[PDB]
């Protein structure tokens, strides 16, 4: 959100990965 | 850490109210209670293990200790829910980074020196869906990993390490700390695996900055820090004292700028000392 790294966007990438791994 | 200095900076008095935002093992809270037991102290930590120690402490000190379990970003809601108005606290303490429980428990996955699942979540098992460090290095792409290692770890070899991680995980998922440490070392010659300050000091493993980067990302520590500071400022009374202990340049820079009000005559800056940590203390005007 505020330090140059988009945690929201990257978290959603990770959560798609974790769903694929299920 | 700096226990005499922190307590002396907070200067606790009979009847005062304190917020320890980073209870950890309770070291600072117990040192405050030892200098003055006639206080109220709200003790917060995002880590179940630390919060449980606060709960256990509250049985010895039922009138004084209120244990809370939550992140800095959750502190405002927890306080309001506890009936604490803004402008309440005489002092707020933030001792940043990791507790000894997190670093010394192999299973929590914070150390490259002790093998365990690559977890690194300060929240423990509180949020089963919260991504682990393994989820991070297994899911993100090379330029994302390199941005994290450079921005949060200040790692100059971010790109060479990120490439090593993507290559390695293509063969086999990265799930444990020593596994990751040796993948990171693989992106260097066998001689560079240890760094040291001088000839006599301890060897430091080359993957140390990468582990710090992952920890800060997994736990959103710098964004959390900014929220905790604003929450500290809102809930301090005028004349109350903020004491923060920083252990790397990124968090210290955020504290410095927040105190200068130039994140974009609110504080009296009363201490800057290093002790390795950098202590900054200030009085809310
Ligand atoms: C450096 S240790 C503090 C140790 C403590 N002062 C003592 O004397 O033992 C940091 C502690 O604060 C917690 N912490 C770090 N970031 C946090 C955050 N964003 N929200 C809540 N707690 C956090 C960690 O879980 C850890 O237990």
Key descriptive features of the protein:
heterodimer; A: mainly alpha; 1 helix; 68% helix; B: 285 residues; alpha/beta; Rossmann fold; seven-stranded mixed β-sheet; two-stranded antiparallel sheet; binds S-adenosylmethionine
| CATH fold-level name of the largest domain in chain B | Rossmann fold
Radius of gyration of chain A: 10 Å
The helix/strand class of chain A is mainly alpha
SSE string of chain B, helices as H and strands as E: HEHEHEHEHHHHHEEHHEHEE
* Highest-level CATH class of the largest domain in chain B: Alpha Beta
Figure out the total of helices of chain A: 1
Computed Rg of chain B: 20 Å
Query: How many separate structural domains of chain B?
Result: 2
Describe it for me?
The complex is a heterodimer of chains A (22) and B (285). Helices cover 68% and strands 0% of the residues of chain A. Chain A has 22 residues and is mostly helical. Chain A has one helix at 7-21. Chain A starts with 6 loop residues before the first helix and ends with a helix. Chain A is built from one helix and no strands. By secondary structure, chain B is α/β, with parallel strands linked by helices. Chain B has two domains: 3-100 and 221-284, Rossmann fold, CATH 3.40.50; 110-218, Orthogonal Bundle (DNA polymerase, domain 1), CATH 1.10.150. Chain B has helices spanning 3-10, 27-35, 48-60, 72-81, 100-104, 133-139, 142-153, 158-171, 177-186, 208-219, 221-235, 249-259, and strands at residues 17-20, 40-45, 65-69, 89-95, 194-195, 204-205, 236-246, 267-274, 278-284. In chain B, helix 3 links the parallel strand 2 (40-45) and strand 3 (65-69). In chain B, helix 1 crosses helix 2 and helix 7 (142-153) packs across helix 8. Chain B is globular. Chain B starts with a helix and ends with a strand. Classes of the chains: A mainly alpha (22), B alpha/beta (285). The A-B interface holds A 1-5, 7, 10-11, 13-18 and B 129, 131, 135-136, 138-140, 144, 147-148, 151-152, 217, 220, 222-223, 226, 250. Bound molecules: S-adenosylmethionine. Chain A: This is Putative ribosome-binding factor A, mitochondrial. Chain A: It is found in: Mitochondrion. Chain A: Belongs to the RbfA family.
